[PDB]
């Protein structure tokens, strides 16, 4: 018996806007099909639906926790056939950016080294603004040999082209001497 194969609605579904579907090839007559989810069979929940007589899988409310391996298997007396595991990639939107040096104050002459982390599925589009004027289009903002009162509000802007949503964090940095 040929090994089953799997096909999907969307190779790269997006969080909170897309819905995925799964179809396994064999579609044999007088046969029963089942689905394995990371080694677990038939998770009973309205979110996961099975239609066309245990043939098509459907998943709504796609979130970042749906990245689980799915397998379609055919159940017969001697079939014992399961498709090769397939991994799903959820294109979830960017989270709240965090600036790794959480100190709100620095010393004179300290090398400003700010790293902005967003933890999105693709690499987020990073931009840095100082007092509202764009400065760079990178993730790490580096300023060396800072001058007293060159301070202000530094903003990391994080963008995702999959969802288009914004996410900006503004932190106030000042130095006395």
């Amino acid at each position, epitope marked *: 018996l040929p090994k089953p194969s799997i096909s999907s609605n969307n*190779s*790269k579904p997006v969080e909170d806007k897309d819905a995925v579907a799964f179809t396994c090839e064999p579609e044999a007559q007088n046969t029963t099909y089942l689905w394995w989810v990371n080694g677990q069979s038939l998770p009973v929940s309205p979110r996961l639906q099975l239609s066309n007589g245990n043939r098509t899988l459907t998943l709504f409310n796609v979130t970042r926790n749906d990245a689980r391996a799915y397998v379609c298997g055919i159940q017969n007396s001697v079939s014992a056939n399961r498709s090769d595991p397939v991994t799903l990639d959820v294109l979830y939107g960017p989270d709240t950016p965090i600036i790794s040096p959480p100190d709100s104050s620095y010393l004179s002459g300290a090398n400003l*080294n700010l*790293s902005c982390h967003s933890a999105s599925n*693709p*690499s*987020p*589009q*990073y*931009s840095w603004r100082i007092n509202g004027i764009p400065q*760079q*289009h*990178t*993730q*790490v*903002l*580096f300023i060396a040999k800072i001058t007293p009162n060159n301070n202000g509000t530094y903003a990391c802007f994080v*963008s995702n*082209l*999959a969802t288009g949503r914004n996410n900006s964090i503004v932190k106030s940095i000042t130095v006395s001497a």
Partner: antibody
Amino acid sequence: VQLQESGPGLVKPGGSLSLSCAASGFVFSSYDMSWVRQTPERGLEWVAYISSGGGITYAPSTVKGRFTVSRDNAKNTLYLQMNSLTSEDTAVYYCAAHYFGSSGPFAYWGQGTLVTV
Amino acid sequence: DIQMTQSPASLSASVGDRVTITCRASENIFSYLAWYQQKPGKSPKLLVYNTRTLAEGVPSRFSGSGSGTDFSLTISSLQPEDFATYYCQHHYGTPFTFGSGTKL
């Protein structure tokens, strides 16, 4: 915005070479960079990647190893190391910066250096 | 992985003629395509990054468009300076793959 490349040049196919890329006019540390090589037959292709101050590295699926990347932000110098040269490694190499990280376009291209082996 | 194919292999046009270059991707890249213009014997230069924004104050003649698998770049007016060797890149994620190229 100056990015000057350098390489040993023509070498024995059984040898090895080390590339270098010097930077000036902009902050080297804050910018991620990568290696793009061009051949008159195949065209343009991407052969290396580096993040800020080391860290995550990525290589093309064609060859899992045989490629080493090392950047020194204090010296503003990015180095690529290759060994076990093959007849298809003859190309012109460019070191190019990035926007927005590893998901952005290739900006600030360099003059580049040709090499044959 | 990701394969980029440029439909116009080569073409010729007069000065002041609207021209279009079309690139296609094997898989789905949302809006990450960029166009690189290379002069003969010169390094490539970036244009139309994120497929809708021009780069570094270049003239507004260039316009990128398209969503999904297919993308296009249009020049409304062609200047006496002959432009050629336009490449399309996706840079959605590693690995990065370029297009074949268009000579005009």
